[PDB]
Amino acid sequence: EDPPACGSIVPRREWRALASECRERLTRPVRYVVVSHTAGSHCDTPASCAQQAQNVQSYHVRNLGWCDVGYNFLIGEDGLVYEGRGWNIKGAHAGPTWNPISIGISFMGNYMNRVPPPRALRAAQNLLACGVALGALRSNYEVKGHRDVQPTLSPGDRLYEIIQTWSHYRA
Amino acid sequence: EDPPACGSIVPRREWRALASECRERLTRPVRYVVVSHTAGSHCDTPASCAQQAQNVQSYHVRNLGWCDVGYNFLIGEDGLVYEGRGWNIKGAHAGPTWNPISIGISFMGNYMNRVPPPRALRAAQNLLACGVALGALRSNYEVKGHRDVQPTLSPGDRLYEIIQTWSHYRA
Amino acid sequence: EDPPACGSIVPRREWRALASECRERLTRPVRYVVVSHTAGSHCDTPASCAQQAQNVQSYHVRNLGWCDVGYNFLIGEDGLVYEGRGWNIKGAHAGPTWNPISIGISFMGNYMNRVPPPRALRAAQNLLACGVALGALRSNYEVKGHRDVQPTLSPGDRLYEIIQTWSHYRA
Amino acid sequence: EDPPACGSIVPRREWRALASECRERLTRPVRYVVVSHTAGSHCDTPASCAQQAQNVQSYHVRNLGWCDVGYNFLIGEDGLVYEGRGWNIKGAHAGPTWNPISIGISFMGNYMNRVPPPRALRAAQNLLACGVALGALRSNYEVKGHRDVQPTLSPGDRLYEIIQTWSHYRA
Numbered sequence: 001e002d003p004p005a006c007g008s009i010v011p012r013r014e015w016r017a018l019a020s021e022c023r024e025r026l027t028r029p030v031r032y033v034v035v036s037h038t039a040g041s042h043c044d045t046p047a048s049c050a051q052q053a054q055n056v057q058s059y060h061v062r063n064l065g066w067c068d069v070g071y072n073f074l075i076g077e078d079g080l081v082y083e084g085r086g087w088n089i090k091g092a093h094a095g096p097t098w099n100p101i102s103i104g105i106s107f108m109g110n111y112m113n114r115v116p117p118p119r120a121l122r123a124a125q126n127l128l129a130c131g132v133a134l135g136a137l138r139s140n141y142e143v144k145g146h147r148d149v150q151p152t153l154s155p156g157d158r159l160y161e162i163i164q165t166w167s168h169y170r171a
Numbered sequence: 172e173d174p175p176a177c178g179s180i181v182p183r184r185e186w187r188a189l190a191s192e193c194r195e196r197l198t199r200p201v202r203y204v205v206v207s208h209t210a211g212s213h214c215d216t217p218a219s220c221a222q223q224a225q226n227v228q229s230y231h232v233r234n235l236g237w238c239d240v241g242y243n244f245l246i247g248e249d250g251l252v253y254e255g256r257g258w259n260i261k262g263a264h265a266g267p268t269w270n271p272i273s274i275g276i277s278f279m280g281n282y283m284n285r286v287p288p289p290r291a292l293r294a295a296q297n298l299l300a301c302g303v304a305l306g307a308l309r310s311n312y313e314v315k316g317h318r319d320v321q322p323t324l325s326p327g328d329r330l331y332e333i334i335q336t337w338s339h340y341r342a
Numbered sequence: 343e344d345p346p347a348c349g350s351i352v353p354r355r356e357w358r359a360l361a362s363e364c365r366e367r368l369t370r371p372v373r374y375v376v377v378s379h380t381a382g383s384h385c386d387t388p389a390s391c392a393q394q395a396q397n398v399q400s401y402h403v404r405n406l407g408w409c410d411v412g413y414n415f416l417i418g419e420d421g422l423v424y425e426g427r428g429w430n431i432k433g434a435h436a437g438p439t440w441n442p443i444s445i446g447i448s449f450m451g452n453y454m455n456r457v458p459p460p461r462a463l464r465a466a467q468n469l470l471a472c473g474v475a476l477g478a479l480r481s482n483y484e485v486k487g488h489r490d491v492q493p494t495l496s497p498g499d500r501l502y503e504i505i506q507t508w509s510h511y512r513a
Numbered sequence: 514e515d516p517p518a519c520g521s522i523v524p525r526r527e528w529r530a531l532a533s534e535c536r537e538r539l540t541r542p543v544r545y546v547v548v549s550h551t552a553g554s555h556c557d558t559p560a561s562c563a564q565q566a567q568n569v570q571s572y573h574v575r576n577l578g579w580c581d582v583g584y585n586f587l588i589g590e591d592g593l594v595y596e597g598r599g600w601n602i603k604g605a606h607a608g609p610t611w612n613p614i615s616i617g618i619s620f621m622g623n624y625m626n627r628v629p630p631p632r633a634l635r636a637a638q639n640l641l642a643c644g645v646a647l648g649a650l651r652s653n654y655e656v657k658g659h660r661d662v663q664p665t666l667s668p669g670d671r672l673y674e675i676i677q678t679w680s681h682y683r684a
């Protein structure tokens with residue numbers, strides 16, 4: 001019934017992100033969502049996750065030389081979502097074919113033999129519903145696992161197994 | 172005008188590869204080589220390695236819908252090099268910025284907690300030496316680990332540790 | 343295969359096409375689409391365009407000796423798509439290398455100094471979407487300029503600039 | 514900024530439409546499609562037809578005081594479809610009972626003693642199929658004539674007998 005009717009996100013300033021230099025935009029409404037995992041260590045507190053988001057971005061910006069952390073959003077096990085490039089900026093998370101047409105959300109950690117806590121799954125699914133309500137994502141958007149569009153084990157066997165059951169999943 | 176027959180490479184026909192639909196070419200001499208691992212199961216016999224190469228290609232062609240296996244060459248633990256897209260066709264292994272200026276060689280297996288056997292490493296260095304002798308690679312080519320140009324664990328912790336010591340490795 | 347017959351295409355019979363003698367088939371689904379221009383006269387009415395398509399086929403058949411108009415489909419400035427050899431038959435528009443693995447669509451007119459009207463651009467893009475829907479083209483098909491696969495001016499500088507901005511365009 | 518709309522519909526702005534002031538919405542997917550003729554002048558080219566859509570709109574807006582042209586979509590004899598109120602906005606073409614539950618498509622011209630060209634009929638069929646793909650029309654919708662729901666000879670005797678032969682028509 002009123003404008004800002006969706007999910008909470010930790011803003012860039014809050015997790016002390018380096019300023020983005022990316023300018024290429026995505027065309028909303030976006031149809032695809034690609035779920036990946038950072039494949040590294042997980043975090044489970046606002047404190048550790050903010051730090052983890054800073055490290056992921058550092059690697060992408062410092063080492064890979066990218067304009068900003070590749071993901072549009074990051075999901076910490078603290079149950080919070082971390083603002084990446086956002087709903088309107090093209091990400092670098094699934095290749096030249098899917099980057100310009102999807103939203104890349106990455107779960108912080110490695111989920112090959114471990115599943116994310118319920119609160120992390122709720123945060124991600126709450127975020128997608130937020131993207132629909134805002135008009136950032138199509139009402140009939142499609143969820144893919146990173147390994148469905150790129151050769152990689154991401155988002156991890158256990159997590160990949162989870163998203164396959166999701167309402168919007170379409171391999 | 173010197174022609175060296177230093178190719179102990181297993182032809183696509185020999186490992187029963189599906190025909191390639193790729194047509195884009197690489198401009199020789201190529202300056203970079205990006206080393207990755209398939210992060211899948213490894214193989215130590217010509218027979219099992221031809222089969223694993225088939226699987227890797229099947230994943231890329233049938234699941235990802237690609238023209239061919241993304242790597243220019245694959246390295247088996249059987250100590251043999253398996254022909255991928257070859258020296259002249261641009262591969263799909265390190266992104267839009269690196270694919271067109273590099274040769275991607277991938278070790279079949281996951282090297283986070285395993286090192287490839289000496290014979291696999293010998294195969295890879297001999298393959299790169301052969302590339303220089305043919306004119307396909309610059310004599311002063313630079314080797315990069317996959318994780319140095321893209322966010323990923325590839326080529327695995329132990330293998331990455333090994334290639335960082337290589338003469339041609341560059342930050 | 344899939345219920346929806348897609349897009350509005352002017353049937354061969356409607357533009358008074360000479361019967362085709364072509365028999366070689368394409369392998370479904372097709373990966374490539376080569377965009378060309380006829381470099382001939384443009385037409386902006388259903389009548390003038392049915393005539394020009396007849397003229398193009400006439401030149402190809404009667405003067406070049408081809409089994410039919412070499413293009414799989416023709417686009418008119420009248421905003422309609424004119425059926426050539428169709429989705430299932432191999433055309434003659436990009437040479438011995440590409441003809442066997444691509445769909446050739448051609449805009450009727452010379453676009454070195456002119457751009458095709460928006461209706462022609464929309465007709466071309468919906469035809470392709472239709473090809474994908476029909477299973478004739480791969481979901482991840484790639485669009486190429488005629489100049490990218492053969493040494494030619496086709497499809498003309500102005501049109502070439504436009505197809506480069508297309509989502510499925512790959513240099 | 515991505516690929517354009519299906520059915521190759523000439524956008525409002527392309528046929529130089531006055532801005533719409535309508536707000537009442539239909540709840541897609543819609544169950545009915547009512548076919549009428551404008552009983553106005555006919556046109557057979559993109560230029561003439563854009564002018565006629567302007568004429569029809571001008572009459573409904575300037576003279577009848579409507580928020581926009583009554584029809585959701587207009588079909589020209591040039592074989593193109595012209596965007597009227599579109600898929601989401603309730604039209605004014607079949608009265609208070611039928612306007613809120615149907616999509617109204619109108620053939621530009623008088624068809625009492627004339628049949629519209631095959632392409633105009635194809636554009637109409639193509640428009641309806643693209644409505645389902647978009648999710649605006651019920652995958653299994655129903656088609657009615659103007660005289661089947663209102664006391665009028667619209668869409669004309671000739672055009673009326675043709676739509677009766679359609680596969681989605683309902684008594």
Ligand SMILES: CCCCCCC/C=C/CCCCCC(=O)O[C@H](COC(=O)CCCCCC)CO[C@H]1O[C@H](CO)[C@@H](O)[C@H](O[C@@H]2O[C@H](C)[C@H](N)[C@H](O)[C@H]2NC(C)=O)[C@H]1O
Nearest residue numbers: 094095097149150235237238263264265266267482512513
């Ligand atoms: C200039 C012309 C180049 C093309 C010449 C080759 C002709 C035909 C090749 C096969 C087609 C590939 C392009 C279209 C495409 O299917 O995209 C891929 C997405 O999967 C799917 O659709 C799955 C369909 C299922 C969904 C059903 C609707 C990946 O995206 C890929 O696109 C490019 C080429 O493959 C690569 O540069 C890119 O590089 C890299 O390649 C490496 C695998 C690397 N590890 C990286 O992952 C990638 N780069 C980045 C930055 O992520 C790669 O991931």
